[PDB]
């Protein structure tokens, strides 16, 4: 019997037989809902995601998602460097002696004698071995002798760095370190632990970023999501931002599925938003080795080839490690299919 | 893109390969033709000869085995074909049925180079091509009257659906303590011959089957999971104008392509309700 | 008529005529009470005033006089240097921070930001412009920057060197000076203003002694007689000690005249004690241009020549400026008289 | 130290000079002799000749004028002598009195080279030696009967004490509105001729005078200050054995040397009481 004998083929092509029963007709049917991604293809080339960003922003989903695109909307204009700036910054002498006086007590007399007797060293010892720290410090703030000029600091902290937050901070600024702040100073004052990293490690980037990272993790893990991303954006750790976003993926596809969308519309829409959100973000930072990311990368490939847009598909194919066979195979297939 | 007059006798099958660039047809003239389509052009590349009767169907194999094409015909045999060094040649021949073979299909490339064959003799055959070349198949009695189609389920444990002229649709699964494919489920729902059956490759929890029949109706069979039964769902409440002859699923999107007798092709997709509509 | 026709002549000689009326007899009569000064002549040569000192000490007059000879009795044994020694000498770290804390207030936050932002300079400014001097000092006790490392000292004193004697002393030790102590610190703590001179001017003797002197004057003029002499003895200012002793002369000759002595015994005894006391003292210090001293020097000469001891007389004649005519004349007279 | 037989006639005066080393004597032989005494030796150096009568006294002048000696004699004249280039020679001669000159004495070197002369003619003469040499003296009538001695007061205003044979002692002071020495005080206290008077050179507030007499007593006259009168004080309550002939004060210590007629020399000093006793 006569019949179209229709079939689907790679690239979203439809093969059928003409009514005359003697001809073959290949085509690319218009599937309402499925459209090659132009914006992405065109922005990925003209590297101007103004429109793409403006699209996602104007049709964003949940509140959180809006921040990310806004984070990207402004990162778009101001630029990476200028962004991290506005994001990591912030909002009596005299005395004239008078009248008679006298060395009262043994303590005073002993220290005084030391001084005059040019024995600046002992003066401090005798001072510390009494609660005349203020003085001990004053004498030391006059000599050059470092070990002495330091035997007092370690003496101040010794009994104060624990009764005063500013004391504990000094203790750290003094001893050229951040480990303490970075790990115990309240996360709310992060923009500070932030300056203590750029301040202590201004010429050692590897360390500067190992610390900035160590902080981001702490922020994100203690309610500062938006901020931990800022720190990451400055540490050049796309991996951390990727990981966060991959964990937030499910719940995101769920809020879409409840929004009157078929299992496919949701899955489709989701993977697209994530891919466009990841692409634009990876375009401003200093950054594939994450399995799931790769896995989901491959996924977007197929949805793209099915749109017939083999060009945008290859672009993402390139960015994947040519070490992965699935990546290998699809690389070859897309080639012949288009070539 | 149209390639008018690819054959002078009526054509029964036209399939594009793994890259959707290499065409292939078959018809009553008892021959197959290889084409190369680009934009809106085309160039014949060869004409396969051998079948003693009208050729019913063809199926391209996965590239990882080479450039092969399989065909079956009213002549009750199946011929595999190869394009090595730039020329097509009949490598093997499968003929264990005593009546027209109506469908043939290459399993998923994971199973290796296996072929699913269905015939009007009521049997279905599973064939692999040994290390040396010859063939030692599996033959099962799968339908009374005659079998018109057979399709492989995607890979995980291996299953395939057949569609007979006994109006039934049937799922099959391979079993060890039998060394054969055993009948897992019988799905009743057509009042006339089942012409074709297509198992969707969709990788979602739910499995989709689409059977087409001489009764002018399409049924989408679905199974939520192993504990679920196969639920019947007519493609549309009203019967169609003519006999539905074929069913084909896209590779993504799970979109069904229905080929009617009024030589018309309708396209469908599923919606929030679980009911189909024009895509 | 016959008669001895006696006469007195220089050197205490008595010329008379023998009873035979034809001979002349010169002699040196024994005047009970008048005796050539051997001890002085013998000690002035053997420079061992142990006996002389032991003589004056065992027969001293008033209490004050006793101190001077004792001052000389001990100065005798111990020696000058060793004397000025025994006379001018004298009789918690840790802290471990704990728990949450936070930058409370604008002040703290501003200073903290400064620190981390490697801006050690501003931190201090913001500190001083608040009563966070303790801190301002702590920051400064960490840098090298002198002007800053000093902008705070001048800030401490500015409001404390007047409410604390030790503060005012520091102010001086700091600014390498003594003028303040030397002129206002209580005379009772002189052994201190003493160490502040030897301490600040250890390699500038002219100044060391100008100050030591400036102090001695203050002591002596404020009840510290015995002590001002010690300071003078170390400044090498025999002139000051001489002047004090010449003013104390009268009263001294008076206490002697009330002690059952003729106007002469008193005057005689007095000038002798003063001369022996001055000689022994000038023999241990680092030292004539004082009129009265000269004047009284000449006086002792005559009393000595009258004893016939022309040798001891010449000795003192030598020590006088051969610029003085009276000194000239007597130098000549003593010569012929003895030669 | 003794120089026996310095003269063969009785000797009346022996005086050592400013250095107390150069001796000089005089006696009836009408000659003076210069000696040089050391330890216990002596060597004559010359014999002065000229006086026509026994020589009574001699006085050495202050070295600042040269090496001079003055003498006076019963012959009623005074001769000055010099030792220039190594030899003594009569430079000048003073003779204005008409009777024995008994004393002569050089004023304090501050007044210049003045000479105090006293004679049995009752007068006293003051003589300086002009720029050219000659002499234009002061002559005053100072005692009845005769003047036996005269001594100069130390320097500040110039005063001198005389002692006559009228038993009186007398202080004299120079006056401008008279161009002469005027009688300032008369001290009564001896009952017989006054043989000598000595004004002590002591530089203490109090002035001391010592007069010796033919009455066998010595009197020490003292004056506390200008407003005080001259108080009389016998050297000792009991008279002496013989006539006192001379009085001499040391240069320091204010010790008096009394020369008696029993050719004995007593020495005295003052004590807390203001009374004299053997020194």
Residue numbers in the entry:
A (entry chain A), C (entry chain C): 379 to 469, 495 to 690, 694 to 745
B (entry chain B), D (entry chain D): 2 to 157, 170 to 292
What does the paper say about this structure?
We therefore analysed the structure of the interconnecting rods by focusing the refinements at the mid-points between vertices. At this resolution we can distinguish helical profiles and individual blades of the Sec13 β-propeller. Surprisingly, we detected a previously unresolved extra density attached to the rod halfway between Sec13 and the dimerisation interface. The size of this appendage is indicative of a full domain. The average of Sec31-ΔCTD rods recovers the characteristic features and has similar resolution to the wild-type rod, but it lacks the appendage density (orange arrowhead), confirming this density most likely corresponds to the CTD. Since no atomic model for the Sec31 CTD has been determined, we built a homology model to fit into the appendage density. Rigid-body fitting the homology model in the appendage density shows consistency of size and features, although at this resolution we cannot determine the precise molecular interface. We show that Sec31 CTD is as an essential node of the outer coat network that binds to Sec31 α-solenoid domains. When the truncated form was the sole copy of Sec31 in yeast, cells were not viable, indicating that the interaction we detect is essential for COPII coat function. In contrast, when the cargo burden was decreased by deletion of the ER export receptor, Emp24, Sec31-ΔCTD supported viability. This phenotype is similar to the depletion of the Sec31-ΔNTD or of Sec1326, and leads us to hypothesise that Sec31 CTD binding to Sec31 rods stabilises the COPII interaction network, thereby imparting rigidity and strengthening the coat.
COPII mediates Endoplasmic Reticulum to Golgi trafficking of thousands of cargoes. ER export is mediated by the coat protein complex II (COPII), which minimally comprises five cytosolic proteins that form two concentric layers on the ER membrane—the inner and outer coat. The inner coat layer consists of the small GTPase Sar1 and the heterodimeric Sec23/24 complex, whilst the outer coat layer comprises the rod-shaped heterotetramer Sec13/31. Here we visualise the complete, membrane-assembled COPII coat by cryo-electron tomography and subtomogram averaging, revealing the full network of interactions within and between coat layers.
